[PDB]
């Protein structure tokens, strides 16, 4: 039986482009084409891992500190880690230190050092230093030992996760997304957060925290993907939040990639118009950018959210020719690509792709 040639068009499913961006399919399947201590610099970020009795109590104090609008400038990691330790790992810090997630973080220069504190009076005791900013230490010491918060570590984390999906868009779009999502979860009877948390003041505090702190974002993403069973109401929210945040700030370039990929009866390949000499330079840079992205594996889809290096090179605007081919193919199927606009200079390439597609549809 000879070849039954069939044209199926672009990979609008998004499956193939996802595998390419997460390193599960090598880029050579579609495309073609050591740093030393004396040459490079690695910034180590030491994160104290405080083992403590009454981890619940300390977590309540941490929550109440955030509720009071306390701004942990760059000493938030230790306290935020205790929240994640208490909720996700239920106290077991040693199991966490063995995770593949910690190994990945050690790639980012993170160094987790355990520090045993038999008993700590308050949060001021968990930030020892003779030189650092003392405004926080005095503030944390000024915090009352009174229990005031209505929530727990789980709710704080699930609430924070709501900021992930639209974090990269801006403060207005993010907060509005949080508000809508809170209503969805509340109406469906999944979770109900404290009233005071939904105030503009409190939401702004959590927004500034999420936007500046890499670790809390990563740990939520870690929890959302690698939690396999025993899901709380909180775990469910977190998993849903992380799922929605997938490829946030990368959706446009991803659809461009989808439409420059062509599927036939033989398999998937790059669009012929993308294989011309005129565009080979753009494809080379694009492959290099995807390669840098794919090294992050299962964390690649949150690359723009986590502000990983090189992700700026994935803005579709940098690839007008590929965008043109992508839109050219899209328009042939009566479809359109959101956020993609081809200038007059590339319309000829755009029309060529359109005419090419409507030709192949036999």
Curated annotation (Swiss-Prot):
It is found in: Virion; Host cytoplasm. It comes from the Viruses. Residues 340-362 form a coiled coil. Belongs to the filoviruses nucleoprotein family. Oligomerizes into helical capsid to encapsidate the viral genome, protecting it from nucleases and the cellular innate immune response. VP35 binds to and stabilizes monomeric NP, keeping it soluble. Upon virus replication, NP is recruited to bind cooperatively viral genomic RNA and VP35 is released. The encapsidated genomic RNA is termed the nucleocapsid and serves as template for transcription and replication. The nucleocapsid is helical with a pitch of 10.81 NP per turn and a diameter of about 22nm. Comprizes a N-terminal arm involved in oligomerization, a NP core region involved in RNA binding, a disordered region follwoed by a C-terminal tail involved in protein-protein interactions. During oligomerization, NP N-terminal arm binds to a neighbor NP thereby displacing VP35 bound to monomeric NP. Homooligomer. Homomultimerizes to form the nucleocapsid. Binds to viral genomic RNA. Interacts with VP35 and VP30 to form the nucleocapsid. Interacts with host PPP2R5C; this interaction leads to VP30 dephosphorylation and viral transcription. Interacts with VP24; this interaction facilitates nucleocapsid assembly and genome packaging. Interacts with matrix protein VP40; this interaction allows recruitment of the nucleocapsid into progeny virions. Interacts with host STAU1. This is Nucleoprotein. The lineage of its organism: Viruses, Riboviria, Orthornavirae, Negarnaviricota, Haploviricotina. The gene is NP.
